[PDB]
Ligand binder design. Structure first.
Ligand SMILES: CC(=O)O[C@@]12CO[C@@H]1C[C@H](O)[C@@]1(C)C(=O)[C@H](O)C3=C(C)[C@@H](OC(=O)[C@H](O)[C@@H](NC(=O)OC(C)(C)C)c4ccccc4)C[C@@](O)([C@@H](OC(=O)c4ccccc4)[C@H]21)C3(C)C
Ligand SMILES: Nc1nc2c(ncn2[C@@H]2O[C@H](COP(=O)(O)OP(=O)(O)OP(=O)(O)O)[C@@H](O)[C@H]2O)c(=O)[nH]1
Ligand SMILES: Nc1ncnc2c1ncn2[C@@H]1O[C@H](COP(=O)(O)OP(=O)(O)CP(=O)(O)O)[C@@H](O)[C@H]1O
Ligand SMILES: Nc1nc2c(ncn2[C@@H]2O[C@H](COP(=O)(O)OP(=O)(O)O)[C@@H](O)[C@H]2O)c(=O)[nH]1
Ligand SMILES: [Mg+2]
Lengths: 328, 427, 440
């Protein structure tokens, strides 16, 4: 099996950390990330090795700053190429509330600050429009959903209040019943759907009415490749499912999916039964976590001393995921 | 004037309240003074003015009461020994009581854990200088286990000076809950490290040995177990408070038994256990009383102290006997117990005497101490925790209450080293 | 203060209440016994003013209460010739929608239409008072009003009241039964509770009850009217006990966690060890702590859940009347002393024990003893793990295999309700099994 690739990324201090005069307890060198314990400075710092240890603590003017472009060119680009080979792929962002999950996956729409999802979509349509072999034709379908307190909402159709039911097809696996799947023929169109979708996510008074730290966003692309040949006249089809996930903060029930995800990752890392069905998230992502798929995790890290316990936990879960191997 | 704060929580705490306190219109309760000098009265009060300050001494019952599921309301409030008092009573309005540390502690308790601030404030004020914070509490309580640590934490936070005295209830090889492994482990990190100064143990699995060996009882009882504890508290709380030739104020309690900062836990005994009938053996002896104060069999806790060495031993005897007699006898304990004495430490045993023997024993013996043994009481809940809650995990229940990998992992590692650090003494 | 809310669901349920509501007949009620002088029908307690449903009085004077009938049938009983029990008017629903056996029917069909009005009743009902800490559901594993209607009524209640774990009762198929529908069918009704919500559940195995009546009591001839008491009584222990003043008390929120070991709705077993004959002579009295063992005996066992298989899990025992502390701590130890109990790999002194008073209630000859010491075993053992298999061999062949749905489709959705209910309730089988099959 192909190992689930893992990258961790540390961001610059945020307003909260700055207001408390937080010092940085994270260091990086090569693919290694080291964390210092602010409370017990007497211990030896804990080190972890990953596929990538992204230092994005400073700013683009730094030669060593890990940009949106590097993060995408390493893992995003690799997964898209696998999609073209016909493999199902998945990338999920994991980490403590405010560590930088949405920035990594979505980013912002200015300044070359766009994240993995916008860059991959753009790259996808660019490659398709660069085609010169008329025997090849393509189809791109998109779906975007939110998972909040186990409830699934269609972000491309906020015009319906049904909490879509996650089901298990008797032969084809899990799916979200009646989730809209829209055909898109340009990057501009897909971006427009992405934008309105981002506008439909649940917000929380508790988060100063910002997007709720407890909702999961799953962005799916169904990429179909049709290859003709004037001969016998059969067109062959290659279908790849691209799943781009932006998880709720790692720190019918509020934290079921996240706690269950932890258990699934731990169990898989150990095994190499698994509670996939214990949560809607792990259920829908069953094949991406141990199944027929090329998967990658990007763990977001706060650099601050005040978030030591949470950051250590993220590093430890990312270390375990690194041990998972899917069967493709 | 060394007045006193009564906080009673959960089941074990509220009910335990029932049995500590009633041993008090025995009259001394917590810091007035007087009364108890020429009998008289009874109940849930006397003649004056209320509120509060008549505390645990003349016209009033002072306590802070904390119930989180209206069990302590009805169980005692009414027909029973009290009034209590009004205004001094918490009923959680149905919170629904919770099993789970995180649950009244993080959840319903916060909301009440704030309403418990008002109780503490009014008592604190009383016009007397308060030196105790007395709290009953339950490993596996959630309300008590994780509400008691909330209550404890603010009280250490706001009352650093005033060492907390907390009564404990524990895990012994027998069980309540299944979540009590970890429930009391999280009740821990907070009971060490949470301004709780000294810490009492009251294992119910050890309480029986006592109520049934020493005692005969034919069929104990949870109310009868409440006779036991009163014993262990009156010595500490009444004794030394109530009059006395070497008198140990509660604070002697925190330097005598803690020899260091992490929450020193103790085990405590009452000898004068007696047998109704057997009533006739050793006229309230000292050796009698010393004898019974160390045995493996007379400790009213879930550690059997014999495995290891105690580190600190605080004993208290209030029978009207020789101040020469008690001190001369306690030595003999110390010399056939070497290995039970901590090589550091001299004066491995402190002795206090107060001047009135418990109403109707004639002569009393209270015991306190920490030995190396407890590396036990925990190397048991931790084996429990790692393999339980933290294990293949049991906290979905708690996982909604609001604690996520934390309060588990931190409670094992912090409470763990407890095991190593504790051992450290005398390996 | 911590009320329960009592919901019935079907034939199995409207009656079962008659067993629940009669068994109550001691001045208690869902969660408010906070006391009453009335007695009997309650007639004699007074009329203080009032009208349908009683403002004059509390649930105490009159109940916690909500019967759903999708046929008048059982409900006409409870309404039946003021059937000797007028327990209130207007806590009954009687839907003459014509009854439907189908998970699909009533649940998708007639029930949809009158699950609401009911929701309304519940809601109002859920409001008069304070602390409702509980929802009781009588459920079958066959009765249209009990599957889809309950997968409807549990589902909406879970969705609407996430914080209040539902307790539901069950009367599941085994080797014998009714219908053909019920091998799957209850399957369908099993999907829904599940992740719709639900908490701990309980069952009476109808094939276990009539068994225990033949191995532990006497009367092989017996009527279901009597089997309801065996199951009726289970409740009295669960709610009347934990809901009444005593030592070590488990509330409805104690029930959830002590049974629940992981999150795919879990199931439980009920053992009532006091079950002595009218024709017994229990060794003048039956030993209190033997009562505990009574529990484990596969024999009290309500269901055909061969404990033989596997390791229990959660064990919640509720003792009531004249029980001794030293009886529990010291008898409960013993069990965890046999080989057999084989508690699980992560059970940590699994046993949860409560004491309640008064005594074991009783009425009439059909009621056995006046036993003065009770054991209620509510457990989660691997077994369950096999009865669902049973229903799953039935299903792989009764519904899906060659399909018995043409009735059912008629009422609503195909290709999941079925396929989804097999795969989701299935893994139940695998996941369950893996809950207790290795050290890991
Ligand atoms: C405690 C004690 O000494 O309990 C026992 C049971 O095994 C213990 C040994 C005692 O020798 C014994 C047996 C007595 O014979 C003694 O003469 C006596 C005392 C000293 C009373 O105790 C008191 O008056 C004390 O003042 C006692 N008061 C006390 O227990 O008050 C309560 C109100 C809690 C009862 C107390 C002790 C320490 C500090 C402060 C007070 C309690 C007693 O009822 C009695 O308890 C019992 O028969 C008995 C049976 C089951 C449960 C409990 C007690 C008592 C009486 C009056 C008989
Ligand atoms: N033990 C027991 N089982 C009962 C009782 N009432 C019903 N059952 C069982 O419930 C199952 C279904 O009963 P039914 O009366 O057919 O259910 P229903 O409510 O009619 O079913 P629908 O017409 O679909 O709504 C059968 O297997 C019965 O054995 C009862 O009082 N006790
Ligand atoms: N690599 C990076 N470089 C510069 N700024 C970054 C950054 N990563 C994150 N940030 C900034 O840090 C802040 C928090 O990041 P973000 O909002 O994406 O976190 P998050 O998605 O983990 C929060 P939640 O858990 O609530 O969903 C934002 O203001 C974001 O722009
Ligand atoms: N000594 C004593 N122990 C009790 C009493 N009530 C309960 N306990 C014990 O303490 C444990 C926790 O009970 P309780 O105090 O009600 O727990 P909590 O309130 O949920 O924390 C139980 O498992 C019992 O063993 C009591 O009145 N006295
Ligand atoms: Mg985000």
């Amino acid at each position: 099996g192909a190992s689930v690739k893992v990258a961790v990324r540390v961001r610059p201090f945020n307003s909260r950390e700055m207001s408390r005069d937080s010092k940085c307890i994270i260091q990086m060198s090569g693919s290694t990330t080291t964390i210092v314990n602010p409370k017990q400075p007497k211990e030896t710092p804990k080190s972890f090795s990953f596929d990538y240890s992204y230092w994005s603590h400073t700013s683009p003017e730094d030669i060593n700053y890990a940009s949106q472009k590097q993060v995408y060119r390493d893992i995003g680009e690799e997964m898209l190429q696998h999609a073209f080979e016909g493999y199902n792929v998945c990338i999920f962002a994991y980490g403590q509330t405010g560590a930088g999950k949405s920035y990594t996956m979505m980013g912002k729409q200015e300044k070359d600050q766009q994240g993995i999802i916008p860059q991959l979509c753009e790259d996808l349509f660019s490659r398709i429009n660069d085609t010169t072999n008329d025997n090849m034709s393509y189809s791109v379908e998109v779906s975007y959903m939110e998972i909040y307190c186990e409830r699934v909402r269609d972000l491309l159709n906020p015009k319906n209040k049904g909490n879509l039911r996650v089901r298990e097809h008797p032969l084809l696996g899990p799916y979200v019943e009646d989730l809209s799947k829209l055909a898109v023929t340009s990057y501009n169109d897909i971006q427009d759907l992405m934008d309105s979708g981002n506008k439909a996510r649940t917000v929380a008074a508790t988060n100063m009415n910002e997007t709720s730290s407890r909702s999961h966003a799953v962005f799916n692309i169904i990429f179909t490749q049709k290859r003709h040949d004037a001969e016998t006249n059969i067109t062959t089809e290659k279908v790849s499912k691209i799943s781009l996930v932006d998880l709720a903060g790692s720190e019918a029930n509020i934290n079921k999916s996240l706690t269950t995800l932890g258990k699934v990752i731990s169990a898989l890392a150990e095994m190499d039964f698994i509670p996939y069905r214990d949560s809607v998230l792990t259920w829908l992502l069953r094949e991406n976590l141990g199944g027929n798929s090329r998967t990658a995790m990007v763990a977001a890290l706060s650099p601050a001393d005040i978030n030591y316990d949470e950051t250590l936990s993220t590093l430890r879960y990312a270390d375990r995921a690194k041990q998972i191997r899917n069967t493709v | 004037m060394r007045e006193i704060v009564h906080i009673q929580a959960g089941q074990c705490g509220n009910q335990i309240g029932a049995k500590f306190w009633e041993v008090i219109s025995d009259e001394h309760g917590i810091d007035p003074t007087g009364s108890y000098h020429g009998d008289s009265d009874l109940q849930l009060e006397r003649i004056n003015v209320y509120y509060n300050e008549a505390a645990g001494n003349k016209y009033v019952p002072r306590a802070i009461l904390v119930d989180l599921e209206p069990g302590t309301m009805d169980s005692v409030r009414s027909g029973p020994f009290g009034q209590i008092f009004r205004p001094d009573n918490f009923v959680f309005g149905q919170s629904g009581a919770g099993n789970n540390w995180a649950k009244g502690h993080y959840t319903e308790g916060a909301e009440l854990v704030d309403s418990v601030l008002d109780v503490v404030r009014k008592e604190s004020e009383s016009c007397d200088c308060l030196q105790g914070f007395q709290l009953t509490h339950s490993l596996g309580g959630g309300t008590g286990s994780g509400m008691g640590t909330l209550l404890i934490s603010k009280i250490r936070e706001e009352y650093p000076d005033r060492i907390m005295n907390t009564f404990s209830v524990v895990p012994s090889p027998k069980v309540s809950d299944t979540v009590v492994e970890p429930y009391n482990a999280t009740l821990s990190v907070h009971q060490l490290v949470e301004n709780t100064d000294e810490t009492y143990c009251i294992d119910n699995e050890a309480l029986y040995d006592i109520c049934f060996r020493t005692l005969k009882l034919t069929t104990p009882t949870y109310g009868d177990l409440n006779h036991l504890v009163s014993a262990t508290m009156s010595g500490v709380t009444t004794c030394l408070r109530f009059p006395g030739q070497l008198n140990a104020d509660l604070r002697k309690l925190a330097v005598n038994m803690v020899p260091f900062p992490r929450l020193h836990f103790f085990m405590p005994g009452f000898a004068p256990l007696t047998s109704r009938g057997s009533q006739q053996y050793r006229a309230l002896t000292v050796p009698e009383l010393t004898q019974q104060m160390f045995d493996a069999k007379n400790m009213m806790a879930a550690c059997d102290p014999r495995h290891g060495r105690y580190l600190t031993v605080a004993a208290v005897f209030r029978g009207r006997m020789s101040m020469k007699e008690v001190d001369e006898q306690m030595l003999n304990v110390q010399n056939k117990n070497s290995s039970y004495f901590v090589e550091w430490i001299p004066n491995n045993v402190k002795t206090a005497v107060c001047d009135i023997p418990p109403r109707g024993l004639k002569m009393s013996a209270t015991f306190i101490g920490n030995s190396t043994a407890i590396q036990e009481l925990f190397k048991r809940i931790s084996e429990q925790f790692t393999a339980m809650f933290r294990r293949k995990a049991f906290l979905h229940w708690y996982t909604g209450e609001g604690m996520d990998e934390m309060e588990f992992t931190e409670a094992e590692s912090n409470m763990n080293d407890l095991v190593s650090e504790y051992q450290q003494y005398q390996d | 203060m911590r009320e329960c809310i009592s919901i019935h669901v079907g034939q199995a349920g409207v009656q079962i209440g008659n067993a629940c509501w009669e068994l109550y007949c001691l001045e208690h009620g869902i969660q408010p016994d906070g006391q009453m002088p009335s007695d009997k029908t309650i007639g004699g307690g007074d009329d203080s003013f009032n009208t349908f449903f009683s403002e004059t009085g509390a649930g105490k004077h009159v109940p916690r209460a909500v019967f759903v009938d999708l046929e008048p049938t059982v409900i006409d009983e409870v309404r039946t010739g003021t059937y000797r029990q007028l327990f209130h008017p207007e806590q009954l629903i009687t839907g003459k929608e014509d009854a439907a056996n189908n998970y699909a029917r009533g649940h998708y069909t007639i029930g949809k239409e009158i699950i609401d009005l009911v929701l309304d009743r519940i809601r109002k009902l859920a409001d008069q008072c304070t602390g409702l800490q509980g929802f009781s559901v009588f459920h079958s594993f066959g009765g249209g009003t009990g599957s889809g209607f309950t997968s409807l009524l549990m589902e909406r209640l879970s969705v609407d009241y996430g914080k209040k774990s539902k307790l539901e009762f069950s009367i599941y198929p085994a080797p014998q039964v009714s219908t053909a529908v019920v091998e799957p069918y209850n399957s369908i009704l099993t999907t829904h509770t599940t992740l719709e919500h639900s908490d701990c559940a309980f069952m009476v195995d109808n094939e276990a009850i009539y068994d225990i009546c033949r191995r532990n009591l006497d009367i092989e001839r017996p009527t279901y009217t009597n089997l309801n008491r065996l199951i009726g009584q289970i409740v009295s222990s669960i709610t009347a006990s934990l809901r009444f003043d005593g030592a070590l008390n488990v509330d409805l929120t104690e029930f959830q966690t002590n049974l629940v070991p992981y999150p795919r709705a879990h199931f439980p077993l009920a053992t009532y060890a006091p079950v002595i004959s009218a024709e017994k002579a229990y060794h003048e009295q039956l030993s209190v702590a033997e009562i505990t063992n009574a529990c484990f005996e596969p024999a009290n066992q309500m269901v055909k859940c061969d404990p033989r298989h596997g390791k229990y899990m959660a064990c919640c025992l509720l003792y009531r009347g004249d029980v001794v502390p030293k009886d529990v701590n010291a008898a409960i130890a013993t069990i965890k002393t046999k080989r057999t109990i084989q508690f699980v790999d992560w059970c940590p002194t699994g046993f949860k024990v409560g004491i309640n008073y008064e005594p074991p209630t009783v009425v009439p000859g059909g009621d056995l003893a006046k036993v003065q010491r009770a054991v209620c075993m509510l457990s989660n053992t691997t077994a369950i793990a096999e009865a669902w298999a049973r229903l799953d061999h039935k299903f792989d062949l009764m519904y899906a295999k060659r399909a018995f749905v043409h009735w059912y489709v008629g009422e609503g959705m195909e290709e999941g309700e079925f396929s989804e209910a097999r795969e989701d309730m299935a893994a139940l089988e695998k996941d369950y099994e893996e809950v207790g099959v290795d050290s890991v």
